Amino acid sequence: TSDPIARNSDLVSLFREVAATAPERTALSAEDDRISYGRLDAWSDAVARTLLAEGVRPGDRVALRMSPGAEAIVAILAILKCGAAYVPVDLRNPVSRSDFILADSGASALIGEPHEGCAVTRVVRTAAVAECKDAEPPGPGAEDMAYVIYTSPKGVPVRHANVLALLAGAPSVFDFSGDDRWLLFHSLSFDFSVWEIWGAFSTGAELVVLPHWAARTPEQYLAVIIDRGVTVINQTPTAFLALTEAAVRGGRDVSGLRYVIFGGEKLTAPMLRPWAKAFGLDRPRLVNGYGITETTVFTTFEEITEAYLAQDASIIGRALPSFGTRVVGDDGRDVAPGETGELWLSGAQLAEGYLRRPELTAEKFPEVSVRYYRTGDLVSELPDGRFAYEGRADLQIKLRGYRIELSDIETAVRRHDDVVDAVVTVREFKPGDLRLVCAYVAREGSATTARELRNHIKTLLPAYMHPARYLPLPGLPRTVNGKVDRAAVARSW
Numbered sequence: 001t002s003d004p005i006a007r008n009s010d011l012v013s014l015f016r017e018v019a020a021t022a023p024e025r026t027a028l029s030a031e032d033d034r035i036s037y038g039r040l041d042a043w044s045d046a047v048a049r050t051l052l053a054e055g056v057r058p059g060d061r062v063a064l065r066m067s068p069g070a071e072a073i074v075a076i077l078a079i080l081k082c083g084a085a086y087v088p089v090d091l092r093n094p095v096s097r098s099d100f101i102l103a104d105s106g107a108s109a110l111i112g113e114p115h116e117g118c119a120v121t122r123v124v125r126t127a128a129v130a131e132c133k134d135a136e137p138p139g140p141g142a143e144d145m146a147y148v149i150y151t152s153p154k155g156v157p158v159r160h161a162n163v164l165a166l167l168a169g170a171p172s173v174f175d176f177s178g179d180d181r182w183l184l185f186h187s188l189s190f191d192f193s194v195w196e197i198w199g200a201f202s203t204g205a206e207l208v209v210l211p212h213w214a215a216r217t218p219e220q221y222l223a224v225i226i227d228r229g230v231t232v233i234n235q236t237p238t239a240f241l242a243l244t245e246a247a248v249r250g251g252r253d254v255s256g257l258r259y260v261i262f263g264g265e266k267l268t269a270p271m272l273r274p275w276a277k278a279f280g281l282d283r284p285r286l287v288n289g290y291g292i293t294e295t296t297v298f299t300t301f302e303e304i305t306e307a308y309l310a311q312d313a314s315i316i317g318r319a320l321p322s323f324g325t326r327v328v329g330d331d332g333r334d335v336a337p338g339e340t341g342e343l344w345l346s347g348a349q350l351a352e353g354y355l356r357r358p359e360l361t362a363e364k365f366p367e368v369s370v371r372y373y374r375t376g377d378l379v380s381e382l383p384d385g386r387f388a389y390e391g392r393a394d395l396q397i398k399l400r401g402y403r404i405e406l407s408d409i410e411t412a413v414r415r416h417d418d419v420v421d422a423v424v425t426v427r428e429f430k431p432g433d434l435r436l437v438c439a440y441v442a443r444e445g446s447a448t449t450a451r452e453l454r455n456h457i458k459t460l461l462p463a464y465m466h467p468a469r470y471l472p473l474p475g476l477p478r479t480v481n482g483k484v485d486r487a488a489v490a491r492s493w
């Protein structure tokens with residue numbers, strides 16, 4: 001085969017081939033600074049030498065604390081070239097979380113800027129990375145770790161082969177080429193960034209760095225994606241709401257985009273209809289992606305169609321080629337098609353397990369012989385094999401003599417045309433009087449009363465599942481990993 005993705009078994013061999021083949025092509029740009037693949041390859045080899053001198057060796061975990069930018073990408077490549085795995089430290093971590101990640105991962109060096117009180121001593125600072133930039137021109141194997149990203153905190157080691165499997169699966173859904181330009185946006189601590197970086201590099205495309213000046217507003221974001229000829233962007237549904245409003249109000253031309261890829265959050269039609277109204281569904285194509293750190297970024301995709309806009313649920317679509325699936329009931333047996341159950345996943349994109357958590361790993365990665373990962377997500381299979389996303393599987397509570405599926409109440413609230421987000425919690429009204437309540441986010445340009453939401457829910461659910469009060473918020477508060485902060489919601493009440 002001529003295909004570098006199919007032919008290489010690790011990310012370093014892949015990158016080296018893609019660079020050596022056409023080294024003058026642009027790999028990375030930051031404003032007008034264009035860094036060719038050849039330049040990036042030499043630069044990251046020089047930084048790898050610097051890491052070797054700090055005693056980094058194959059199998060090590062090297063911490064990385066940098067904002068997404070050219071130096072950070074050089075640092076990742078250098079770490080991988082040393083046969084080591086990178087452990088990204090979210091810049092916004094509380095100090096204690098960063099301390100735990102560094103301890104738990106056994107990180108033996110850090111590249112970038114240490115957090116205040118950082119216990120890792122062997123540091124290659126960002127400035128030392130930049131110093132290697134224009135100097136001249138043992139490697140990992142498939143089963144070597146490429147990164148350890150922390151979730152919830154549990155460390156998830158993902159191997160070179162896991163990432164290659166994802167990359168080999170992408171073309172079943174996307175038409176990418178080396179003429180695309182991908183925006184690097186997400187924190188290196190989020191696996192969305194693994195996809196932004198390797199989607200670009202695996203295809204010989206250009207990774208465009210969002211400048212620091214453009215970090216704050218959707219107007220600034222749009223200005224850059226249009227100025228720099230970006231063709232692929234990856235966004236949370238939440239970010240997409242802000243992007244749409246800015247594009248529409250600002251009269252911007254979005255039609256240079258080829259793909260907008262959503263991930264991380266439930267996507268429903270009220271989040272999509274305003275963009276589709278202004279811009280249609282072809283240029284760019286919009287594609288909902290569902291996935292998990294434990295199964296290498298993306299598992300299923302659903303390209304958005306008119307049919308998506310006409311229904312009120314969330315459809316995550318079909319699994320990539322590497323995957324086997326089950327939808328599993330409480331009794332541990334498969335549900336009947338159409339029934340809601342827990343998604344279980346198998347295949348080459350599954351991580352090996354968690355780092356130093358044998359107990360959790362055995363529970364979350366059972367064998368059935370086929371090895372599975374229990375997603376903790378409830379889904380249902382549609383007649384055609386596409387999956388609908390329901391909610392997290394840990395949201396049943398006991399209240400007032402009932403078991404109550406909070407995920408079902410959230411889904412029902414999300415069916416309302418003017419709602420873009422919702423969370424249901426329990427709060428105390430008077431002393432011994434606890435009741436369901438719902439905080440929600442209105443679609444921009446709408447306002448819905450609690451009475452109207454009550455009337456909506458009356459048609460869908462029995463009374464014991466009705467929220468007693470509704471609270472509109474200008475967005476729900478999010479945790480570190482970007483999940484809804486149910487404790488912060490409680491405080492907002």
Ligand SMILES: Nc1ncnc2c1ncn2[C@@H]1O[C@H](COP(=O)(O)O)[C@@H](O)[C@H]1O
Pocket residue numbers: 151191262263264265266267288289290291292293294316375376377389392481
């Ligand atoms: N398209 C999506 N729709 C709904 N939930 C999603 C989607 N993508 C990711 N998630 C949620 O995010 C979790 C993965 O979190 P993370 O491992 O931080 O990527 C999944 O288990 C889902 O609960």
